[PDB]
Every structure is written in structure tokens, then in C-alpha cells.
Design an enzyme around this catalytic site. Structure first.
Site, short mmCIF file in Angstrom:
data_model
loop_
_atom_site.label_atom_id
_atom_site.label_comp_id
_atom_site.label_asym_id
_atom_site.label_seq_id
_atom_site.Cartn_x
_atom_site.Cartn_y
_atom_site.Cartn_z
N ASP A 31 -0.08 17.93 5.45
CA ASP A 31 -0.94 17.01 5.80
C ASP A 31 -1.34 17.17 7.42
OD1 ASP A 31 -2.57 14.47 6.89
OD2 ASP A 31 -0.89 13.26 6.69
N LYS A 40 -9.05 17.43 15.17
CA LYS A 40 -9.63 17.17 14.09
C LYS A 40 -11.11 16.51 14.24
CE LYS A 40 -8.48 15.11 9.55
NZ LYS A 40 -6.99 14.74 8.90
N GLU A 93 -7.65 14.22 0.98
CA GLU A 93 -6.44 13.28 1.36
C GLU A 93 -6.13 12.00 0.33
OE1 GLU A 93 -7.17 12.29 5.50
OE2 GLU A 93 -6.95 14.39 5.97
N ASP A 138 -6.33 3.71 3.76
CA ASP A 138 -5.86 4.70 4.57
C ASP A 138 -6.06 4.46 6.17
OD1 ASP A 138 -4.52 7.13 6.00
OD2 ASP A 138 -5.65 8.55 4.72
N1 LIG Z 1 7.11 1.67 10.96
C1 LIG Z 1 5.66 1.59 11.44
N2 LIG Z 1 5.11 0.50 11.66
C2 LIG Z 1 3.81 0.46 12.16
N3 LIG Z 1 3.20 1.57 12.38
C3 LIG Z 1 3.68 2.82 12.20
C4 LIG Z 1 4.94 2.87 11.65
C5 LIG Z 1 5.28 4.15 11.51
C6 LIG Z 1 4.09 4.79 12.01
N4 LIG Z 1 3.06 3.83 12.39
C7 LIG Z 1 1.78 4.17 13.03
O1 LIG Z 1 1.33 5.17 12.06
C8 LIG Z 1 -0.22 5.72 12.82
C9 LIG Z 1 0.01 7.13 12.53
O2 LIG Z 1 -0.13 7.38 11.13
P1 LIG Z 1 -0.48 8.67 10.34
O3 LIG Z 1 -1.00 8.33 9.19
O4 LIG Z 1 1.00 9.20 10.33
O5 LIG Z 1 -1.53 9.41 11.19
P2 LIG Z 1 -2.77 10.54 10.74
O6 LIG Z 1 -2.37 11.04 9.34
O7 LIG Z 1 -2.84 11.52 11.63
O8 LIG Z 1 -4.00 9.30 10.68
P3 LIG Z 1 -5.11 9.50 11.48
O9 LIG Z 1 -4.97 9.42 12.92
O10 LIG Z 1 -5.72 10.98 11.19
O11 LIG Z 1 -5.95 8.53 10.81
C10 LIG Z 1 0.46 5.65 14.40
O12 LIG Z 1 -0.14 4.55 15.04
C11 LIG Z 1 1.90 4.95 14.34
O13 LIG Z 1 2.51 4.50 15.54
#
Ligand SMILES: Nc1ncnc2c1ccn2[C@@H]1O[C@H](COP(=O)(O)OP(=O)(O)OP(=O)(O)O)[C@@H](O)[C@H]1O
Length: 381
Positions: A8, A70, A175, A198
Site C-alpha cells: 500500500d 502521490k 485500493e 476509506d
Molecule cells: N488509532 C488511531 N486513531 C486515530 N487516527 C489514527 C489512528 C491510527 C492512525 N490514524 C491516522 O490515520 C491517518 C493515516 O491513515 P492511513 O490509511 O495509514 O494513510 P494513507 O493510506 O496514506 O491515507 P491517505 O493519506 O492516502 O488518504 C493519519 O492521520 C493517522 O494519524
């Protein structure tokens, strides 16, 4: 093809998994984290940092950090989306070979330009290294995921990023599809409609997929390109910056590194508040050699962000409209992205669907990599 990895490649965080000893293993990086920031930076000595070390490097020069590649990948310089995004990116972007190349000082006054796919290659290289450390051997081949709305050039640029990183990207998969595969939704009988919600770090994607005969069709997509967990952090930042001003009289935004410190601690507290009801934010030498110590409740976190949370329902309604479906037509709901760990977000989606439980049991920030690794397992043979 050896052991094929599933990656990912996220806007903000990336994740790698492999199929080993009969199941998918999500791999921790060298800092012990199962997700890695899609972030690059440079030391003054000219060392290139990638992932956590790059995001965590304290700096008074945000112009030499690179992230959000990205947003630019597979796009032309003159793409209106690029021209809008460059307004908000702190690093220099210049027109080169029709594309938006990133320009940074990489040490000692040396300037270099990188194509977006070259930055993404650095992130893939880190993901490759993470897998190789776990496996105890080299890997050469990968399944990599992209947003369902990615076009021909964006998909090809993603494959090119792989090539630069020494990865043969054997399959590019969408995705939301990878998430559905993680949950075994492809191995189901009959026609079913799946809503994938998502909500990540920087972006919000909603996708309606149909599944039949183990073949997925992306029927409609929507979302918001600039709504995610980073926006929730910023609401909390604004809260504590204002409180510190009313408490001490002083504005901390004058010091880059203070803001950076607070951002790191606010993000950690947000994550804590998905599983506890209050969190402590503590920083030594925060501002002017004074310490910072504050608390944040889950209720306050929700109150500060409620409008943003509630705004995520509109694109869901639009996806249904465009698919000619009503809520009751949705057979599966899949939550993806780190921000769906937020209890309030889980509550809101359930309520939107009149009490329907979403799929459960795979960490949402790992589910995309997980489905990629499922497919990679079959290709490894
Ligand atoms: N336990 C939690 N509670 C609340 N938010 C959480 C968590 C754990 C992670 N996060 C928040 O998730 C965000 C990252 O999401 P991700 O799916 O890992 O990122 P990504 O795949 O890059 O998403 P995108 O930026 O491409 O939309 C980031 O903002 C992380 O801070």
C-alpha cells in the site's frame, strides 16, 4: 518471482505485507512501526532520510522535506490539480519534461530535482528494505495498490516508481478492491454491493464495488481529495495554540520546531483517544525554554472535528445516487484508513446505514496492504 510483496503506497503512510507460513504478515519497519510515512528529508551532511526518520527530523527548513508525491504522480505540470496543490506544498515544484519535478537542497547547497515517481521510488525502496529485513533475503517483485480513480498515466508512473526502486510491479490493483479481498469478500456467491469508506491521513475515498464470480467492478467513486486525519490534527493544533496564547500571551507559530513538536504529540494523543477517554500532551523546551503540559478528552476531540466527521456522509450519499442504489442495497461495508479507528467515525457510518455492522478484524490502515499480500501469496506460488 521469489517472494512477492504486497504494498500500500499511501499519500501519507505506506504498508507492506507478505504471505508466509500460511498467512499474511504485516511487516514492521526498522523503527518498529507497521506503517511508514511516505516522507523524505535531507540532513545537513547530505544524508537522505526516508519514512519515520524523515518525518521526525526537527527542521527550520520545511522546503527541503518532501511528502504528498502521490498528489503529483502521473500528472503533467499544467494539470489544474497540480497547479492548485503546489500552492499548499512547502517545497519547490518546477516544470521539467512537461511534469512537476520537486526541487530541494540535499546538503551543502547542492540542488537536485526529482520526478514524483522518483520520490515514490524512495518510499518503495524503504518498503522493500523493510520486507527484506523480515524475510532475510532479497525481493524483486511486488503487487502495488492505487486509488480506483487513478488513470493510465498515474498507474504507469506507479509501476515506474517500482522499477526505479528495483521492484517489478507485477500487478497494480485498486485500493478498495484490495481491502475487500483482505476480508474474503471475493470468495462469496451471488452478486453483492460493497461500499468501501476509506479515510486516511490526507484523503477520503468512497467506492461502490460490485462483486460477482470473484470479479470486482468499480461502479462509482467519490470523496474529498483533501480531507483526512491531518485535518483533524490541525483542528486540535489550533485549539492548543490558542489556549497557549490565552494562557501565556504568546504565539508559538513563530517557531517551526515548536509547531513540529506539538504536531507530533497531538497526532499521538489523537491515536490514544481512539482507545481511551483522555490523553496527556507533554513537551519539554516547547517554546522559549518553557514546558508544555495539557490534556485532551475524547469528547473535546470530537467536538473540535464534528463538522468534518459529518461531512464524510455526503460523498457516500452521492456514490449511492450515482450507482442507482439505496442504503438497503449495500450488502457489505468496509472501513479503510487509519482515521476509521476513530470511534465517532465508526459510529457515524453505522448510523448512516441504520445500524448495519461493517466488516471487522483487520486493522484499517493495514487492510489494503493485507489484500495486496493475499494476491502476492498466490503469485509467489
Ligand atoms: N488509532 C488511531 N486513531 C486515530 N487516527 C489514527 C489512528 C491510527 C492512525 N490514524 C491516522 O490515520 C491517518 C493515516 O491513515 P492511513 O490509511 O495509514 O494513510 P494513507 O493510506 O496514506 O491515507 P491517505 O493519506 O492516502 O488518504 C493519519 O492521520 C493517522 O494519524
Amino acid at each position: 518471482v521469489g517472494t512477492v510483496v504486497g504494498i500500500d503506497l499511501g499519500t501519507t503512510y505506506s504498508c507492506v505485507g507478505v504471505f508466509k507460513n500460511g498467512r499474511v504478515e504485516i511487516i514492521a519497519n526498522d523503527q518498529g512501526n507497521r506503517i511508514t510515512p511516505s516522507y523524505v528529508a535531507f540532513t545537513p551532511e547530505g544524508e537522505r532520510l526516508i519514512g519515520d526518520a524523515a518525518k521526525n527530523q526537527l527542521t527550520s527548513n520545511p522546503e527541503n522535506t518532501v511528502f504528498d508525491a502521490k498528489r503529483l504522480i502521473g500528472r503533467t505540470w499544467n494539470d489544474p490539480s497540480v497547479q492548485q496543490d503546489i500552492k499548499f506544498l512547502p517545497f519547490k515544484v518546477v516544470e521539467k519534461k512537461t511534469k512537476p519535478y520537486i526541487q530541494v537542497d540535499i546538503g551543502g547547497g547542492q540542488t537536485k530535482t526529482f520526478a514524483p515517481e522518483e520520490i515514490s521510488a524512495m518510499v518503495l525502496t524503504k518498503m522493500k528494505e523493510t520486507a527484506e529485513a523480515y524475510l532475510g533475503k532479497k525481493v524483486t517483485h511486488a503487487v502495488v495498490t492505487v486509488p480506483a480513480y487513478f488513470n493510465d498515466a498515474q498507474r504507469q508512473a506507479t509501476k515506474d516508481a517500482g522499477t526505479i526502486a528495483g521492484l517489478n510491479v507485477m500487478r497494480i490493483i485498486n485500493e478498495p478492491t484490495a481491502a475487500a479481498i483482505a476480508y474474503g469478500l471475493d470468495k462469496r456467491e451471488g452478486e453483492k454491493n460493497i461500499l468501501v469508506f476509506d479515510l486516511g491521513g490526507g484523503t477520503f475515498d468512497v467506492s461502490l464495488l460490485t462483486i460477482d464470480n470473484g470479479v470486482f467492478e468499480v461502479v462509482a467513486t467519490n470523496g474529498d481529495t483533501h480531507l483526512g486525519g491531518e485535518d483533524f490534527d490541525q483542528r486540535v493544533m489550533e485549539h492548543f495554540i490558542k489556549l497557549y496564547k490565552k494562557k501565556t500571551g504568546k504565539d508559538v507559530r513563530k517557531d517551526n520546531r515548536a509547531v513540529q513538536k506539538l504536531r507530533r504529540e497531538v497526532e499521538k494523543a489523537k491515536r490514544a483517544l481512539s482507545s481511551q477517554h483522555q490523553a496527556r500532551i507533554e513537551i519539554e523546551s516547547f517554546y522559549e525554554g518553557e514546558d508544555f503540559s495539557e490534556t485532551l478528552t475524547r469528547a473535546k476531540f470530537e467536538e473540535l472535528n464534528m463538522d468534518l466527521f459529518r461531512s464524510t456522509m455526503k460523498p457516500v450519499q452521492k456514490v449511492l445516487e450515482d450507482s442507482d442504489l439505496k442504503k438497503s442495497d449495500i450488502d457489505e461495508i468496509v472501513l479503510v484508513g487509519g482515521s476509521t479507528r476513530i470511534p465517532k467515525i465508526q459510529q457515524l457510518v453505522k448510523e448512516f446505514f441504520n445500524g448495519k455492522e461493517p466488516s471487522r478484524g483487520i486493522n484499517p490502515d493495514e487492510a489494503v496492504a493485507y489484500g495486496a499480500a493475499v494476491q502476492a501469496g498466490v503469485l509467489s506460488g
